[PDB]
Symmetry: D3
Subunit: 157 residues, 6 copies
């Protein structure tokens, strides 16, 4: 069984975001086409462990910001597949940017929406950058070795 690495695109700034984050991670551990251990998770790769909620002294540090930004870009460009855990009502600008970078780097762009939200309107540009969009409960079984283009079964705004 060949295995692909991913970039774990996800907000971590609300309760719905954090719930979906946790669900998506568990789904990935059970997916036999994913090498999760060699994958890139932003929250585990911030420069010196820093997040502006846990060590707010880095809110204005340009060195931390430069290295973390670069590391995230690096995590996209050196992994096979771009994943975007996506809350339709709580969309994230950072993920948006990362989606656009992933497109520029030739990566398959897969959005994953919680089952309870799948169908709800998403930003047109998110719909368009994405190659496919699936429900959280499909993620454990998604075959990342044969990723195909498909349309969201749901609305845009």
């Amino acid at each position: 069984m060949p295995k692909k690495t991913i970039y774990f695109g996800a907000g971590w700034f609300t309760d719905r975001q954090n719930k979906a984050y946790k669900e998506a991670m568990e789904a990935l551990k059970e997916n036999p086409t994913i090498d999760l251990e060699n994958s890139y998770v932003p929250l585990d790769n911030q420069y010196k462990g820093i997040r502006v909620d846990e060590h707010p002294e880095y809110l204005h540090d340009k060195v931390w910001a430069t290295a973390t930004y670069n590391n995230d870009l690096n995590g996209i460009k050196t992994n096979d597949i771009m994943l975007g855990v996506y809350i339709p009502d709580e969309e994230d600008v950072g993920l948006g940017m990362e989606l656009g970078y992933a497109l520029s780097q030739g990566k398959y762009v897969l959005l994953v929406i919680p089952d309870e939200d799948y169908g709800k309107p998403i930003n047109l540009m998110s719909w368009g950058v994405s190659d496919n969009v699936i429900k959280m409960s499909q993620l454990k079984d998604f075959n990342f070795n044969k990723p195909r283009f498909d349309f969201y079964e749901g609305a845009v705004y």
Copy 2:
């Protein structure tokens, strides 16, 4: 003065967004390095003139969505400079995506933040995609013929 064209990146979904939108457009009309008439303004380039507010049934039409998405991408790639009118508390996933695409296409990426909000925290990826971020009051006199790199003087998360 040589003149450069832009893509008018800006949300239109809140009061703050619409205020900044109107301000940014007024600033641009007074900027002598901008050819606004040959610039691309999303809201004036809705596909086949059809207004999504008057006929919301087109938010399930994949052809409308495809053409509009492509027209936005086309508006970025065929113009000199990428402008992102940016509200720190009302960050937009669609703009984020567009910023990422603008980077991929080799464009100068300029964010403009209302003076009342300049300094407030912005997403790391926004900070990073940007080549510069300025206050609304600097936009009238920004020299688009000699755009340079600088950092936001403000917070990032």
Copy 3:
């Protein structure tokens, strides 16, 4: 009127191709948004003036081939807009390649089909690389300063 330069993509291997070629050139001379003199016309940019029809031995010369190929690529990348004069029944692999390169370089890609052939089936990949496809009779008045996305009103296979 600001003016844009183009790369003159067109086959030259049949009667229909040569007719459309001549028509497209005439249309361009009357279009006030085109700087034709600073545009790149393959047939006027043969390497070191050497004419492949008069000396066919250069079709086994790798240096001639390298320089010409590079000059065409250079002609696409250094001009504003990619033009593809396109005959639906006499589709050209070389043009196809050039279209793909033009996309890669961030150029507006415009196909122009003779009015007598507009509507006839075209290759899916041609339909897709295009940002727009118009009839020969619309080329004189096409506004290259505000190029927009639209679909071919015609068949694809």
Copy 4:
């Protein structure tokens, strides 16, 4: 033995094209450096099985066209190697475009010509996009783990 995936670039619109197609597929199944099962074959990935010869009702359907186009691009960008089954006398515009896209995505571009046609003139732009060109009878044994640049032993026009 490491294995690479490919995008199966080939016309399917003439008898020579179909013969070469079949030959190339059989060659690939016997090549131990190719993971054919995880590879992308256009004809097996058209949106809902549709081809305009078998279900001509999709000749004018923009949804089918959008998804199929995107799927083909996706098949190139997510696989290791770009293959072009190529008939010198029956060159294909769609393949041309795909070659150009493959170049833009950093892929090794290998043309394969039937032994009976190898040596015959090919379009200059095809010669140039390609990194290498081989005969059908070399394909079963080609080492895709060590792909190198080499010149066609044959003419261009």
Copy 5:
């Protein structure tokens, strides 16, 4: 005459480099196809005016380094043409990098070699990234509106 902007790629670390630098700048001022005032000259775009010769402590400052590096990249991407003043015996790794970036951004890449050195051996990768290489004495009259592909008439290693 339409005018094009450039990025002034040139070492500044030896006598030969500084001589060629000064010569190339003088040549450019007399070239009527160049808008030198809206061009990007590294040495006139040092971050926040701070002079690295007067305050060498900034060569350990990551913020100074980041901003300057980005400003150079920005200077390449936002200008029409990439110029590389090139001394064959004093080749520069930084220029090499910039050449590679200019290629990636779709720019015409022109090397200019002092007449006294034209013909001397240059690095293969320099020969290859270049779209053309000319002598210092040809720079005043180079037509930047119709830049074409040609080979160095000289040695490569």
Copy 6:
């Protein structure tokens, strides 16, 4: 254990360069995350074995130069990781170009400096293209499956 391929970027034109070259190769053979046998080594892939020191007749051969240049670019684009064996006092223009190409192709860019030179100033553009820089003695143990962004512990000029 997954394994990555590399492009062996290194000068071979001085004694320090050759020493570092040899050291880096030995380090790579002992690294269990590297598939060295499927990696690309310039010196083993020059067109027909030619190097202008061993067969100087190719100093002016454009065919040899074209194919070798293309082969090197191909070696970067088809391998996972870009390596640059780097002497701070003897920087190489060819490597510089290759670094810039590697960036354009989305590759992790790792510089390796001899332990005896680690800390010494490097060109700003080299510092900036690189994602990370390590000492020769770290190379045998570097985990290429989880490559991350980090700053050189050393100066730039």
